[PDB]
Amino acid sequence: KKHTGYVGLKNQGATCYMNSLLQTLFFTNQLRKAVYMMPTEGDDSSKSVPLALQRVFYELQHSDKPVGTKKLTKSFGWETLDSFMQHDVQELCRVLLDNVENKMKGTCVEGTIPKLFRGKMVSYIQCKEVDYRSDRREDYYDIQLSIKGKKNIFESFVDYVAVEQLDGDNKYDAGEHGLQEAEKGVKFLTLPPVLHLQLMRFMYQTDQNIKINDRFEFPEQLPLDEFLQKTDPKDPANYILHAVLVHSGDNHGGHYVVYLNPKGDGKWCKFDDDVVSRCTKEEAIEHNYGGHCTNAYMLVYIRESKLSEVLQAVTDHDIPQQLVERLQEEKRIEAQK
């Protein structure tokens, strides 16, 4: 806190990726401000995920001491020894962001989650020998990128938009045209201001969940224009690395950490539960490539054109005085035992 200006989160069990994700969301300043503005005055403290996230964020903004998350884990009901071990980071991110997206309905920050995180892609099936095509628009809040046998993020995105062949016994049911040989793939229509990329190191013969510790390179600056169906000359898809969520160890267990440059200025900090320290750019990026068991499993990028708005400064006045009073009360009631 005193070294860095940022406070850590308590170790309170095998919550795995949770503390890492919480710092990542907290330092999505535009999301943080919108989270503070949610009308939770009449919410039950034991049950409200929205209020629970306001508390963690408030504590992360104000506290000099490591911040606790028991009321938050309670609120979305992941309380068992291995509850976080049975889920992955994108599943947790969906729970938190869905709950927060609901409460923002009928408020000045409605549709903050889609605005920040939601992109558009087209899933197509095109028949080869008959004139039939099926195009369906899909929304995504995150991308699961294949890393096995891939050297870098570029090769992952190439693999993601690669054409799959439907041949032989795997022919596509084209209705009136019967079974048909077809091509199946996805194209990107839009990339969102805040890009959540999970690296599929943790995957499912042998009936075992395994961790791939192979070298996988990701850059500081990531150009994605070449993966868009139609690019905008005014707004190119140039992305800036904001967060590197790191796991040290193997499939069964290990240590979770997040590297952030919160202001998007290339000044990196390591967030290790209660311990926040300054680190080199090299430690945050290159040292988490893995290869020949400490490596990245999730990357956050922010679109260069949206960086200053996404990372817009947060002051103490951005927290509604009502909300401040309710958490001020909670801290006083607990200080009576």
**β-pair partners for 139:** 120
Whole-angstrom distance, CA of residue 2 vs CA of residue 6: 8
How was this model experimentally determined?
A: X-ray
Resolution attained, angstroms: 2.2
Give a three-class secondary structure readout of 124-164: EEEECCCCCEEEEEEEECCEEECCCCCCEHHHHHHHHCCCE
What would the 3-class secondary structure string for 207-224 be? CCCEECCCCCECCCEEEC
Instruction: Tell me, yes or no, if 255 is annotated catalytic.
Output: yes
**Which residue's entry shows tokens 């679109």?**
303
**Residue 177, strand partner residues:** none
CA gap 318, 315 in Å, rounded: 6
Q: Which of 334, 337, 259, 336 is nearest to 70 (CA)?
A: 334
Strand 294-303 to strand 194-199: parallel, antiparallel, or no bridges (unpaired)? Answer: antiparallel
3 has catalytic annotation: no
Question: Which of 3, 16, 127, 279 does the annotation list as catalytic?
Answer: 16
Active-site position among 3, 252, 255, 293 = 255
For 236, counting Cβ atoms within 10 Å of its Cβ (0-12 exposed, 13-18 middle, 19+ buried), the class is middle
How far is it, in rounded angstroms, from Cα 293 to Cα 295?
A: 6
